[PDB]
Ligand binder design. Structure first.
Ligand SMILES: [Ca+2]
Ligand SMILES: [Ca+2]
Lengths: 90, 17
Protein backbone atom coordinates (compact mmCIF):
# COMPACT_ATOMS: atom_id res chain seq x y z
CA UNK A 1 0.00 0.00 0.00
CA UNK A 2 2.13 2.86 -1.32
CA UNK A 3 1.12 6.14 -2.95
CA UNK A 4 3.48 8.91 -1.86
CA UNK A 5 6.35 8.85 0.64
CA UNK A 6 6.76 12.63 0.46
CA UNK A 7 5.22 13.01 3.92
CA UNK A 8 7.96 10.78 5.34
CA UNK A 9 10.92 12.58 3.78
CA UNK A 10 9.39 15.82 5.06
CA UNK A 11 10.07 14.91 8.69
CA UNK A 12 13.64 14.11 7.66
CA UNK A 13 14.02 17.19 5.46
CA UNK A 14 13.25 19.44 8.43
CA UNK A 15 15.34 19.69 11.60
CA UNK A 16 14.15 18.49 15.01
CA UNK A 17 13.60 22.14 15.90
CA UNK A 18 10.86 22.35 13.27
CA UNK A 19 9.17 19.11 14.33
CA UNK A 20 8.95 20.29 17.94
CA UNK A 21 7.19 23.55 17.09
CA UNK A 22 5.31 21.61 14.41
CA UNK A 23 3.28 20.01 17.19
CA UNK A 24 2.49 23.50 18.52
CA UNK A 25 -0.80 24.34 16.80
CA UNK A 26 -1.18 20.66 15.86
CA UNK A 27 -3.67 20.49 18.73
CA UNK A 28 -5.62 23.71 18.15
CA UNK A 29 -5.57 22.90 14.43
CA UNK A 30 -7.88 19.88 14.45
CA UNK A 31 -11.35 21.14 15.38
CA UNK A 32 -13.34 17.90 15.33
CA UNK A 33 -10.31 15.85 16.34
CA UNK A 34 -11.01 13.02 13.93
CA UNK A 35 -10.28 14.16 10.39
CA UNK A 36 -7.67 16.56 9.04
CA UNK A 37 -6.74 20.21 8.46
CA UNK A 38 -8.68 22.22 5.89
CA UNK A 39 -8.72 25.81 4.62
CA UNK A 40 -10.74 26.85 7.67
CA UNK A 41 -8.57 25.12 10.27
CA UNK A 42 -5.59 26.95 8.76
CA UNK A 43 -6.88 30.51 8.94
CA UNK A 44 -7.89 29.73 12.52
CA UNK A 45 -4.52 29.31 14.22
CA UNK A 46 -3.03 31.54 11.52
CA UNK A 47 -5.40 34.40 12.35
CA UNK A 48 -5.17 33.94 16.12
CA UNK A 49 -1.37 34.18 16.12
CA UNK A 50 -0.17 36.76 13.62
CA UNK A 51 -0.47 35.48 10.06
CA UNK A 52 -3.37 36.56 7.84
CA UNK A 53 -3.63 34.11 4.90
CA UNK A 54 -6.87 34.89 3.07
CA UNK A 55 -9.08 32.18 1.57
CA UNK A 56 -7.25 32.09 -1.76
CA UNK A 57 -3.99 32.16 0.21
CA UNK A 58 -4.46 28.92 2.15
CA UNK A 59 -6.26 27.42 -0.85
CA UNK A 60 -3.06 27.94 -2.85
CA UNK A 61 -0.94 25.91 -0.43
CA UNK A 62 -3.42 23.14 0.39
CA UNK A 63 -3.90 22.73 -3.36
CA UNK A 64 -0.24 21.73 -3.56
CA UNK A 65 -0.26 19.70 -0.35
CA UNK A 66 -3.11 17.35 -1.25
CA UNK A 67 -1.59 15.21 -4.01
CA UNK A 68 -4.78 13.18 -4.35
CA UNK A 69 -7.05 16.22 -4.30
CA UNK A 70 -9.00 15.98 -1.06
CA UNK A 71 -8.26 19.40 0.40
CA UNK A 72 -7.33 17.85 3.74
CA UNK A 73 -3.93 17.63 5.43
CA UNK A 74 -3.02 14.30 7.03
CA UNK A 75 -0.64 13.74 9.95
CA UNK A 76 2.74 13.72 8.20
CA UNK A 77 1.12 15.56 5.29
CA UNK A 78 1.37 18.66 7.48
CA UNK A 79 5.15 18.47 7.08
CA UNK A 80 5.29 18.05 3.31
CA UNK A 81 2.98 21.03 2.82
CA UNK A 82 5.83 23.29 3.92
CA UNK A 83 8.48 21.24 2.13
CA UNK A 84 6.70 21.86 -1.17
CA UNK A 85 7.22 25.59 -0.58
CA UNK A 86 10.55 25.65 1.27
CA UNK A 87 12.94 24.01 -1.21
CA UNK A 88 10.54 24.95 -4.01
CA UNK A 89 12.46 27.72 -5.77
CA UNK A 90 13.80 27.29 -9.30
CA UNK B 1 4.06 29.65 3.46
CA UNK B 2 7.82 29.09 3.33
CA UNK B 3 8.95 30.34 6.74
CA UNK B 4 5.94 29.22 8.78
CA UNK B 5 8.13 28.89 11.88
CA UNK B 6 6.29 31.94 13.22
CA UNK B 7 2.89 30.29 13.66
CA UNK B 8 4.64 27.01 14.45
CA UNK B 9 6.64 28.70 17.21
CA UNK B 10 3.69 30.84 18.31
CA UNK B 11 1.86 28.27 20.44
CA UNK B 12 4.93 26.02 20.49
CA UNK B 13 4.76 22.33 21.35
CA UNK B 14 4.12 23.41 24.94
CA UNK B 15 6.05 20.44 26.32
CA UNK B 16 8.28 22.17 28.88
CA UNK B 17 9.46 18.84 30.29
CA1 LIG C 1 -9.46 18.82 12.19
CA1 LIG D 1 -4.60 14.72 1.25
Amino acid sequence: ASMTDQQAEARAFLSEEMIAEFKAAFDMFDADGGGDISTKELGTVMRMLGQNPTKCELDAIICEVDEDGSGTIDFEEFLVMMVRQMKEDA
Amino acid sequence: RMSADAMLRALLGSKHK
